[PDB]
A paper describes a structure:
Nuclear translocation of the p50/p65 heterodimer is essential for NF-κB signaling. Upon activation, p50/p65 is translocated into the nucleus by the adapter importin α3 and the receptor importin β. In the classical pathway, importin α binds to importin β through its N-terminal Importin-β binding (IBB) domain8,9 and to [name]-cargos through its C-terminal 10 stacked Armadillo motifs (Arms) that collectively form an Arm-core. Importin α possesses two [name] binding pockets located along the concave Arm-core surface: an N-terminal ‘major site’ and C-terminal ‘minor site’ between Arms 2–4 and 6–8, respectively.
The best importin α3 crystals diffracted to 2.10 Å for the p50-[name] complex and 2.85 Å with p65/p50-[name] peptides. The two isoforms adopt a nearly identical conformation of the Arm core, and the p50-[name] P1–P5 residues (Arg361-Lys365) are not only superimposable in the two complexes (RMSD of 1.095) but also occupy equivalent positions. However, the p50-[name] binds more intimately with importin α3 than α1, contributing 18 hydrogen bonds, two salt bridges, 152 Van der Waals contacts, and burying a surface area of 855.8 Å2 versus nine hydrogen bonds, no salt bridges, 118 Van der Waals contacts, and burying a surface area of only 780.4 Å2 in α1. In both complexes, the p50-[name] residues 361RKRQK365 occupy the P1–P5 positions at the major [name]-binding pocket, with Lys362 at the crucial P2 position. Additionally, the p50-[name] contains an N-terminal extension 356KEEVQ360 immediately upstream of the [name] that bears a considerable amount of negatively charged residues, including Glu357, which makes a salt bridge with importin α3 Arg306 in the importin α3 + p50-[name] complex. The p50-[name] occupies the major [name] pocket making 18 hydrogen bonds and two salt bridges in complex with importin α3 versus only nine hydrogen bonds with importin α1.
Author numbering:
A (entry chain A): 72 to 485
B (entry chain B): 432 to 443
Amino acid sequence: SLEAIVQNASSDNQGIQLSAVQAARKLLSSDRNPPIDDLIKSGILPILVHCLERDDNPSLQFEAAWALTNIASGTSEQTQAVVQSNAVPLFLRLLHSPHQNVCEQAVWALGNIIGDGPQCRDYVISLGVVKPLLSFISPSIPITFLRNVTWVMVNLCRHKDPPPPMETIQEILPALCVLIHHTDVNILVDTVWALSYLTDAGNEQIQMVIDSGIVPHLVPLLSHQEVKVQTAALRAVGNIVTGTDEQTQVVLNCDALSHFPALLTHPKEKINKEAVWFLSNITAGNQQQVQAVIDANLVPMIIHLLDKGDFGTQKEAAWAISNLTISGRKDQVAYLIQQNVIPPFCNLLTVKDAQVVQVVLDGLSNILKMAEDEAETIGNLIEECGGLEKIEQLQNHENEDIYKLAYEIIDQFF
Amino acid sequence: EEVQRKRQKLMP
């Protein structure tokens, strides 16, 4: 009976009050479809927030913080009701409790609030959460507490519109530099996912991540035994190599490409796909980065995935092939030709994905444009592949660019 | 893409 719980939670008899707040916590924690709206509409929120002030009773504030944590774990509606009740300043104050459980429950609640969205985390950031949060990182912290802190850190880096403020990224990067040397798998997964969110926010953030010194410790995680670590690390370095040529070179200079044989042959197709996506952002670089892909012996496997991979991997591989014809020399492209790129590249011309068909027609045109001395022979390869029929029936395609360069290629090179 | 955003504290 919730009206009675709310009344009792007000009581000046401590036993009555603690019992009521515990009954609310139990209603919010016993399964994972708690009656959050019922408790909110009861009026219990200001009483719990008041209980957060009871520094004389660490058990009372722990129970209230737990109840509020679980209300804040609901819909954005329910999280914002907690925020509207002024809980955030009281939680920030609890970060300085001498009582580790109380601190931890305050961290947990703030993590739920921060995770609701970017204006919400900006409010929590403006009130100074980051420094006390990061001050918890220590060899003496219980590991389950450290995992809660790192989850909150991921939550602080998760929204990119807008991304967290520059000053916050500057504060969080040294903590991630510390945690990337941790052995616990959960810590590492959180740390690297936080890095993947930070590197997805543009080239200035990528430069900050590079400037922190963390990349030489991120790249070796591409070969971690835990596939969740590998997945996150591959996302993060992939984001970095979407940057400039010099930012890409930083990653390459960490021995990145030596990790890719195992990613390109990985049993998990999502790994193969992200790996080829990464590689495609390398073959879009200068001739030396193209050559680095060639000398790492990755091209036969890229072509194999272009041939036999899942559709997503095939799309990334078509991009890696087409990209190589940007700053690649004629001999690098000729090496592609000697690796029998043409049949599995032409078989993509039938896919209904107009973007893929475009990219493949692009690459074919570029390679034909610069292979003069035996362009005719390459035409044979396109012809005897069955690819010339693909182009001569893409003649009747819907997309303007598609049939445009289909007619163009069939005119000049056939 | 598995990294939690919101976490109910259940009694362990």
